[PDB]
Amino acid sequence: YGAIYSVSGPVVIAENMIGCAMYELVKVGHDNLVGEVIRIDGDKATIQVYEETAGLTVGDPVLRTGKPLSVELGPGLMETIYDGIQRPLKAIKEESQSIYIPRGIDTPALDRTIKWQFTPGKFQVGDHISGGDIYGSVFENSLISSHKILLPPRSRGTITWIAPAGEYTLDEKILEVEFDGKKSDFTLYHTWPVRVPRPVTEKLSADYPLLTGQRVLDALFPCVQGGTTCIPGAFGCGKTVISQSLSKYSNSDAIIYVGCGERGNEMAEVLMEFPELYTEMSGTKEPIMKRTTLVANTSNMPVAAREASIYTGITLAEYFRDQGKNVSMIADSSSRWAEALREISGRLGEMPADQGFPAYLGAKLASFYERAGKAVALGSPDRTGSVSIVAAVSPAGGDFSDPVTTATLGITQVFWGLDKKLAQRKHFPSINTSVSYSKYTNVLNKFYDSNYPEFPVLRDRMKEILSNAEELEQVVQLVGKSALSDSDKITLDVATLIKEDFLQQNGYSTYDAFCPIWKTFDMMRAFISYHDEAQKAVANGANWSKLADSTGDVKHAVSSSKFFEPSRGEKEVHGEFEKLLSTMQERFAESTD
Amino acid sequence: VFPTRMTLGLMKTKLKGANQGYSLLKRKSEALTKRFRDITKRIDD
Amino acid sequence: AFIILDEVIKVTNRRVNAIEHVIIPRTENTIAYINSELDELDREEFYRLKKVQEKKQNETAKL
Amino acid sequence: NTVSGVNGPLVILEKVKFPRYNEIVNLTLPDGTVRQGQVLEIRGDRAIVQVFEGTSGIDVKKTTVEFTGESLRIPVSEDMLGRIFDGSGRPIDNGPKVFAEDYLDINGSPINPYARIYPEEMISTGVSAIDTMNSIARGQKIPIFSASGLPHNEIAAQICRQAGLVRPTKDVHDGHEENFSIVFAAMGVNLETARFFKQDFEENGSLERTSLFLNLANDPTIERIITPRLALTTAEYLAYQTERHVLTILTDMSSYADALREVSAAREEVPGRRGYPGYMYTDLSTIYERAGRVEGRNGSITQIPILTMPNDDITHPIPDLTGYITEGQIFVDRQLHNKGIYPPINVLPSLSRLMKSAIGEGMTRKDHGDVSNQLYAKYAIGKDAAAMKAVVGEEALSIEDKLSLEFLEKFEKTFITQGAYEDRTVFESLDQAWSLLRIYPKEMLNRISPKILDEFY
Amino acid sequence: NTVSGVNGPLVILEKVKFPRYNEIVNLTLPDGTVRQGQVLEIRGDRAIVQVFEGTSGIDVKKTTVEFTGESLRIPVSEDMLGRIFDGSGRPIDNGPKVFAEDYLDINGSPINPYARIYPEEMISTGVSAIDTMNSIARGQKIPIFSASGLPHNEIAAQICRQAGLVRPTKDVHDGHEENFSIVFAAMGVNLETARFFKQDFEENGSLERTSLFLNLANDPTIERIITPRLALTTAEYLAYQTERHVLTILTDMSSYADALREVSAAREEVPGRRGYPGYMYTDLSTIYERAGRVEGRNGSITQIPILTMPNDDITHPIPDLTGYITEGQIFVDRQLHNKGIYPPINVLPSLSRLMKSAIGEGMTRKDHGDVSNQLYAKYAIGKDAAAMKAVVGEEALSIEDKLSLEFLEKFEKTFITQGAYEDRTVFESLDQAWSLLRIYPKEMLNRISPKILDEFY
Amino acid sequence: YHSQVVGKIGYIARCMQTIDPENNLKKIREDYQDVLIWAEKNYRFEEILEASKSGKCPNDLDALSRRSLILLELLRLVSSISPFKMKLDLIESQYEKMKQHVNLWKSDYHVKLNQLNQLTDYLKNAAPTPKNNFLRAMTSVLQMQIAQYGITEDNEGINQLFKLGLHLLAMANEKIDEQYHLFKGYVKDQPEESPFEGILPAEDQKILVKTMIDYAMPKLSSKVLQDKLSALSSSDVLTKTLLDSIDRIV
Lengths: 593, 45, 63, 457, 457, 250
Hints:
Chains D, E: This is V-type proton ATPase subunit B. This is part of a larger assembly, with one copy of chain A, two copies of chain B, two copies of chain D and one copy of chain F. By secondary structure, chain B is mainly alpha-helical. Chain B is 82% helix and 0% strand. Chain B is built from one helix and no strands. The radius of gyration of chain B is 19 Å and the shape is rod-shaped. Chain B starts with 7 loop residues before the first helix and ends with a helix. The relative contact order of chain B is 0.08. The termini of chain D are far apart. In chain D, 34% of the residues lie in helices and 19% in strands. By secondary structure, chain D is an alpha/beta fold. Chains in contact: A-B, A-C, A-D, A-E, A-F, B-C, B-D, B-E, C-D, C-E. At the A-E interface, strand 1, helix 3, helix 4, helix 7 and helix 10 of A face strand 4, helix 6, helix 7 and helix 10 of E.
């Protein structure tokens, strides 16, 4: 049909292509390389391939398969690491002899030899079905069995053939649906476009909090399951430890890890670190690997797999949210996907309008944030689902004037700070109290009123003391240390212990596997009660050295209380929080008198 | 030798902090001279 | 106390005069120089991009 | 009927030259989904148009083309309140249609109604510091300058939700003697913020007086940039045809600037400095040209644009170009929002160039002009006393720096502090500022008259 | 077949697309001299090929072309170590040939020898400050960043000779579990620096076990970028075939980026940011793709790129683009070389995120990564106290500014002070670094645990 | 659009027919007569889709999702209380209380039934162990008290049994001392003498008493104490007097 008109770099153009869509995938050349036509110009279509072509000539045959290019949806996604184009690297590692994306080889995303136990639902022959309806269930792992096999979206009809319970493969038919005549057969695997988002019934408000394990991140801004949050980068300051520790520290039912522009060592270390580590759900036989989905895309691979990796991760997160389970999506970094889109625009020949980046990168980057969120699950069962969008931003230019961070900062709803001077001082993960925003704190305050949490009241005073501590440190360092009140010294002293206990993480605390809300909310009450007791004692008449010497073991115990676990005394509160409330009155009474 | 892309953001805050410190040092020097004149006259008397 | 205030007033006036005299012009010139270099680089990039888009406009006009 | 190709957000289709510029077109694909769009350019058997729903997924030699024969226009009517719409004039509630009675253009000015009257008859919208120190009136515009460190979308939703409740208390004071309406425009917002702002505006009881326009971040830039034209034409048609005071809120300007900067990727036009286009003054002047006092002023068309800076730099033409056309500017500090105050607006850098013309006799307070200058001088003296208090110390601080420092801390949590569901007028804000200003003596108050100062101490 | 045109240094020939992309072509000129070239880009009825032997001698219609029918591949063998080669694989003395026994691609995509494993074997480069603060393992692509106005080639050759000289003491410590190999790649380097690096490699005892590639500035741009793919392919084929730790030095990266930027100025391509090509990240990612541990847990290929800052800033497209793909960084300082510290390397802006994975018990210390956090904050506090002491004066410093200023002068002149041929172990660098930290009390350090700090304090 | 409304009407009619198979709940089926009327008549799917697209049937996805969530919560609460049976008036009172709620998907009543179904779902696939037996008895007592008291009235025993089931489920497989101490402490603080007669099997009480006698038997060293502990482990009831006598003997 088509002929190779030009081949330059990793993208190949094919002329004489009439009747093809903007998402249909076809094989370019005689090697049968995987690719998809993203754009077209006249009679010649520009198809980006997911493999580095180095032995393909111009004039080879290009035959489109007649359908869009996407990934398969079914059982077998967990406990495996794939690429950005839905290709299993485990079978390609032993078969192809290469752990990266090969060239000239084809491998399916779902193996036809793995069998699973399928069970039918309460439906029978004669009942109507729709897109996303619960047709059956399949046990994918030994920890969670909520992997319900659903139909694809935009489908409808009646169940004419119903299969019984038993063990079958993904290629065997188990159900058949036809509305107007025989449409087609159904199987365990389903087809869905990666570039097209999964539809939903209706949107829901974000009111369920999600704890990632970071006390400074959850203390600085309220993290919820279903919101949008960004992570600032500095070209490497310990951002991969926050993504791997945030993914391993998370206790969600689903885990979506997709590397866009990583080097490849962090993906192999994060993949190998998942089987040796244990989760907080009492897992076994690789619980960290079986509970999360691994998508490995590196910078040495093609830009088509790196650009389609976010679409495959958003489609897998949309399928996991449509299944009836809450999943947390971790992506790092968006600067490699925007640089891959700018490399595809510069290689294709499109004129950019973002100071070197493509003009369509803003709509594509802003459209990816709108797909994630919490809402009702699509289908007749009406299940509850959620999807947390956590995408770390990287530098692609200036410090804050980059187009990826500027375009991504508008579409996001939660923003966290990052100290550039504190990041180089070995104090990661650091945050900025002046640069931060969150819109789910008002809706989360209503459920927090029913849960009786005091996180935002201590977080506002900690943000005010941390904001005044930078002005007091800058005014003290600029004007000179010659005179000052006890309120600024007590605020800097409380900000030093709060910045040491909350700022120091990922190698500065003994207990960092799990962080409860009662320990984080009760932990700020000791520092806020010590700062308010020192300010109330200094306001009512007292010396600074008499109050600082009057504190004594309370300041060292409050700073060393972060190393202790919350499993002492009770199941959610430690004994140091209860003893600190009684010792705070004696220390405040002894410091004032 | 400075950065060409996104380099004015640190220089704006550094110039604002230097202007605020110069204003605070000017006010402290004005109050120090204002107390120093009456301290000089009271020291003379 | 008079000798202490007279000793501190010269250091405060000299530090305020030296910092206020030497503070503004270096970053004030460097910010305009970096902004002018960034604007000249952006105009040089757009001027090279317009000539590349001009051939694509005439090539796409034939289809 | 024959799509040539697609490059970026604009699709290049091959059709006849019979369709006019900005005409609606229906693209029929082979999947079973019909999408409408607007023709961006018409030529001699060649044109590039932007689709409203999607930009890819159509065939090159299998799709169909059809022309509706009508220009891009939204039907303006009085029943637009109490419903949710989209950026292209389509309701998303799944209910009744628009049912408008007049044809108003959305890509241009229908009649361009702009009276030559001065700004007067100022009305409040729910902001004590914004309506007090830099209060604007019908005919004048005042933009809000923010950054990436505060909920500017929640501040615009709270400012739009706070409007409409001051009309009953202001009606007794001769400040509003007609129906009041609000114009809500959302561009680049999420479903959680639009549903939370719609539930918050419906919980207070202001959903029946304002219009809801929700634009997603996964749509084309032509719908996001053409979304404020329906709100401006609806506010001008409701203000001119109904003789009622309507307030227009457009958020955010950063999404419209990024959508305008993303456009023009396949044309002869090139962007200016900083990556943005060089025609942003005509784009802001086109949206500013459909707001203000109409000929025969009975109502008012107020434009309050909310702009959020993505980097907080002053080297961009977004805040300078938007602030240069208007008269005044409002700034928001991240340190005030980090403490817990809502809204965290600062009155020190913010100033109004037409504050004396907006205030008068019979529609505003008499001492509001001197109270704003005394509160601004007490806030600047409180900031200077608070900055000098750290260097001077606690035992060596002056009485004026401590008295102004207490008035700055008390005024920062009393005057600027407001409720999310509470509506405070300018009369209650002046009485609240009089209590904070009552701590100073009568000899230290010289920015007001002696009769107004003796009567209101 | 025939030369259609010539734009700059590239020659555009007009002929049918019989040969594949990247295949070697034969060009015959009517002067009695034949030249070989490779098609960098394939097109319909035209091809862009760059001649390796010179750039002069093209004809309009008096030349002929011949297709080889084979793709561009370099034959790698186990006997190529100990020979002198060029950027295209030809000798400059007419001695040893290729002698290849296996077929390898020029990009490394068809092999993919990177096994699923992180770097564990810590390779000591002979520097206590370099291996202490930003120590990398075998397989890490962290290059050494330099700047203009300093001899970065002598420090890179001294660190390369110090790594091979420090490898024998680290072999017994379990730091290296295989042989040591050196890869010398030249691109735009002088003959004196190449002869000095070859004299350092021959003095280190790696002349008979390493490969030498010579590329000058007067040669073609395709040969300089083609030489690092052949050197990385030979080092990856030897490290994967023999299970030996091979170290490849790719200098200079600015000439390779300047060749790719010069190759985009002769065609019709859209330029990226800073006036550079948009496909430089894809070409730079192919050279960095050949790196990591080999399959078997016994071999690995290490790449150390030498990038010189032309403008003295890390915000450039060449240093920022190559630094964005690589992990970590090590920047040199001209003030350290001007002061007398050899080698001058700064520790304030240099930080690696994989130092904990490369480090481990049994080949290093446990508190080495913990001491670098307090040493980085003490080094930044010493620079802030040094700038505040010179800027404001000696009457505005605090008590921590004197200890930080003395710790910055003692640490800057004690840890970074060493010779050019004396090996430095990790235990001696940690013992000498722990003595410089003892200048303040135990209540001023918070970047380390008290249990591990009390055991080694 | 119309396929989700037709599938939601068919699943709502199937859930309504599966909720009450005797036709004894006229209040629950009375509110769903508009959707069950089109499902109780033999009609084609194209007629229901064309009738729903023409405004002749229910086509609100939000109202059908809320009513399908309330009916799915009532059917999930009635199905999660097996093998016990709830009252007929209690299902109509819980349906009327759930219908008048402002947010049924955000309250704790859906999370209590989700955790109660997740406890039996996790305990059904799990092997027989002491924590699975204590969690099965606590899930049976929580199912009997939840079926007897409904989900519209608060109770300290349901929250304490749900917190003990979540704490026992969150524990690992090497915490039998904390599961036995939590089961003995929660069983000792109960007001009833033995909450296993008529709700649990006869072998489960002897297996639990034999598990507690076997757990406390390894700490004794006398022959009389091992004989009394071995003789007290042959009872088919888990009373507090056996645990107090076993604790006093040890």
